Design a protein around this motif. Sequence first.
Motif, PDB file in Angstrom:
ATOM      1  N   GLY A  38       0.820  -1.224   0.000  1.00  0.00           N
ATOM      2  CA  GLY A  38       0.000   0.000   0.000  1.00  0.00           C
ATOM      3  C   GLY A  38       0.837   1.250   0.000  1.00  0.00           C
ATOM      4  O   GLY A  38       0.397   2.294   0.514  1.00  0.00           O
ATOM      5  N   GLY A  39       2.029   1.188  -0.563  1.00  0.00           N
ATOM      6  CA  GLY A  39       2.933   2.328  -0.576  1.00  0.00           C
ATOM      7  C   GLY A  39       3.703   2.531   0.734  1.00  0.00           C
ATOM      8  O   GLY A  39       4.472   3.504   0.790  1.00  0.00           O
ATOM      9  N   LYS A  40       3.478   1.690   1.711  1.00  0.00           N
ATOM     10  CA  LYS A  40       4.171   1.769   2.994  1.00  0.00           C
ATOM     11  C   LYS A  40       5.336   0.786   2.991  1.00  0.00           C
ATOM     12  O   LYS A  40       5.240  -0.305   2.423  1.00  0.00           O
ATOM     13  CB  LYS A  40       3.240   1.429   4.131  1.00  0.00           C
ATOM     14  N   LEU A  41       6.402   1.158   3.662  1.00  0.00           N
ATOM     15  CA  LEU A  41       7.550   0.278   3.843  1.00  0.00           C
ATOM     16  C   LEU A  41       7.312  -0.509   5.154  1.00  0.00           C
ATOM     17  O   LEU A  41       7.362   0.067   6.239  1.00  0.00           O
ATOM     18  CB  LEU A  41       8.770   1.198   3.815  1.00  0.00           C
ATOM     19  N   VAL A  42       6.956  -1.796   5.032  1.00  0.00           N
ATOM     20  CA  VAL A  42       6.534  -2.637   6.159  1.00  0.00           C
ATOM     21  C   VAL A  42       7.691  -3.551   6.534  1.00  0.00           C
ATOM     22  O   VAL A  42       8.054  -4.414   5.723  1.00  0.00           O
ATOM     23  CB  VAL A  42       5.281  -3.438   5.821  1.00  0.00           C
ATOM     24  N   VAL A  87       6.386   0.165  10.542  1.00  0.00           N
ATOM     25  CA  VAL A  87       5.700   0.514   9.288  1.00  0.00           C
ATOM     26  C   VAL A  87       5.968   1.981   9.007  1.00  0.00           C
ATOM     27  O   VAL A  87       5.656   2.834   9.853  1.00  0.00           O
ATOM     28  CB  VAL A  87       4.219   0.240   9.391  1.00  0.00           C
ATOM     29  N   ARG A  88       6.507   2.291   7.850  1.00  0.00           N
ATOM     30  CA  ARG A  88       6.806   3.659   7.453  1.00  0.00           C
ATOM     31  C   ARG A  88       5.889   4.083   6.316  1.00  0.00           C
ATOM     32  O   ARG A  88       5.754   3.382   5.313  1.00  0.00           O
ATOM     33  CB  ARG A  88       8.269   3.803   7.036  1.00  0.00           C
ATOM     34  N   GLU A  89       5.283   5.257   6.497  1.00  0.00           N
ATOM     35  CA  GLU A  89       4.338   5.824   5.505  1.00  0.00           C
ATOM     36  C   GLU A  89       4.648   7.310   5.340  1.00  0.00           C
ATOM     37  O   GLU A  89       4.752   8.006   6.360  1.00  0.00           O
ATOM     38  CB  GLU A  89       2.899   5.692   6.018  1.00  0.00           C
ATOM     39  N   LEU A  90       4.600   7.788   4.097  1.00  0.00           N
ATOM     40  CA  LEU A  90       4.820   9.198   3.797  1.00  0.00           C
ATOM     41  C   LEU A  90       3.488   9.902   3.785  1.00  0.00           C
ATOM     42  O   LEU A  90       2.580   9.509   3.077  1.00  0.00           O
ATOM     43  CB  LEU A  90       5.511   9.293   2.444  1.00  0.00           C
ATOM     44  N   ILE A  91       3.380  10.938   4.567  1.00  0.00           N
ATOM     45  CA  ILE A  91       2.166  11.800   4.660  1.00  0.00           C
ATOM     46  C   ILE A  91       2.646  13.231   4.543  1.00  0.00           C
ATOM     47  O   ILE A  91       3.366  13.712   5.447  1.00  0.00           O
ATOM     48  CB  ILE A  91       1.395  11.607   5.959  1.00  0.00           C
ATOM     49  N   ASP A  92       2.215  13.911   3.499  1.00  0.00           N
ATOM     50  CA  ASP A  92       2.555  15.339   3.325  1.00  0.00           C
ATOM     51  C   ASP A  92       4.069  15.569   3.470  1.00  0.00           C
ATOM     52  O   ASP A  92       4.486  16.574   4.106  1.00  0.00           O
ATOM     53  CB  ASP A  92       1.752  16.203   4.303  1.00  0.00           C
ATOM     54  N   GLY A  93       4.866  14.638   2.915  1.00  0.00           N
ATOM     55  CA  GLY A  93       6.332  14.729   2.831  1.00  0.00           C
ATOM     56  C   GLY A  93       7.019  14.373   4.136  1.00  0.00           C
ATOM     57  O   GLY A  93       8.234  14.431   4.166  1.00  0.00           O
ATOM     58  N   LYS A  94       6.257  14.019   5.167  1.00  0.00           N
ATOM     59  CA  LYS A  94       6.854  13.557   6.434  1.00  0.00           C
ATOM     60  C   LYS A  94       6.825  12.057   6.459  1.00  0.00           C
ATOM     61  O   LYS A  94       5.948  11.430   5.843  1.00  0.00           O
ATOM     62  CB  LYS A  94       6.110  14.108   7.639  1.00  0.00           C
ATOM     63  N   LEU A  95       7.773  11.454   7.156  1.00  0.00           N
ATOM     64  CA  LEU A  95       7.805   9.997   7.290  1.00  0.00           C
ATOM     65  C   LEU A  95       7.232   9.692   8.672  1.00  0.00           C
ATOM     66  O   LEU A  95       7.713  10.204   9.687  1.00  0.00           O
ATOM     67  CB  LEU A  95       9.236   9.487   7.096  1.00  0.00           C
ATOM     68  N   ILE A  96       6.202   8.862   8.645  1.00  0.00           N
ATOM     69  CA  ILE A  96       5.521   8.421   9.894  1.00  0.00           C
ATOM     70  C   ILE A  96       5.836   6.941  10.099  1.00  0.00           C
ATOM     71  O   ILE A  96       5.487   6.113   9.240  1.00  0.00           O
ATOM     72  CB  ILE A  96       4.003   8.686   9.867  1.00  0.00           C
ATOM     73  N   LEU A  97       6.527   6.653  11.192  1.00  0.00           N
ATOM     74  CA  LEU A  97       6.919   5.297  11.589  1.00  0.00           C
ATOM     75  C   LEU A  97       5.980   4.862  12.694  1.00  0.00           C
ATOM     76  O   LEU A  97       5.925   5.481  13.760  1.00  0.00           O
ATOM     77  CB  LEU A  97       8.364   5.320  12.087  1.00  0.00           C
ATOM     78  N   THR A  98       5.277   3.747  12.451  1.00  0.00           N
ATOM     79  CA  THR A  98       4.407   3.150  13.457  1.00  0.00           C
ATOM     80  C   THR A  98       5.055   1.848  13.918  1.00  0.00           C
ATOM     81  O   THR A  98       5.321   0.951  13.091  1.00  0.00           O
ATOM     82  CB  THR A  98       2.995   2.894  12.906  1.00  0.00           C
TER      83      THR A  98
END
Length: 133
Positions: free
Chosen positions: A89-93, A106-117
């Motif tokens: 889904g475009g996330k780096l899992v 899990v890394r996801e790009l939101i508005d050019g920021k990287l969000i790591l969960t």
Amino acid sequence: MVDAFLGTWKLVDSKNFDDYMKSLGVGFATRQVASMTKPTTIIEKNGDILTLKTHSTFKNTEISFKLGVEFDETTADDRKVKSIVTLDGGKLVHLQKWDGQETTLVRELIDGKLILTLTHGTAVCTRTYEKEA
Ligand SMILES: O=S(=O)(O)c1cccc2cccc(Nc3ccccc3)c12
């Protein structure tokens, strides 16, 4: 395509990292220091090989891997795990397995920021990073 993840990322926000570390059995003194350390994640590509560095005044790590191929990893908190990283889904899992336990990074790009969960057990931590020029 992994390309928008590449570069140097600086932590700018953290939620529930203590909960996540505690769930993994990290000792109080390591959690204490970790909670005030500013880390940098560097993600670089050479062909099919990604290298992900974590640098700080406290812990430092480096892994290299091919997407979709298992690799051995020794984590910052000294767990010896079996790892695999995939785009989903475009996330780096990133899934780590050891002793029948699992954790996901899990890394996801939101508005050019990287969000790591980071999830382990019931603990869910969200760490946000901004790109370095
Ligand atoms: O690398 S992390 O993915 O955060 C990481 C992942 C999982 C468990 C960790 C436990 C202690 C410190 C970390 N890192 C750390 C590195 C630099 C500064 C503060 C903490 C842990």
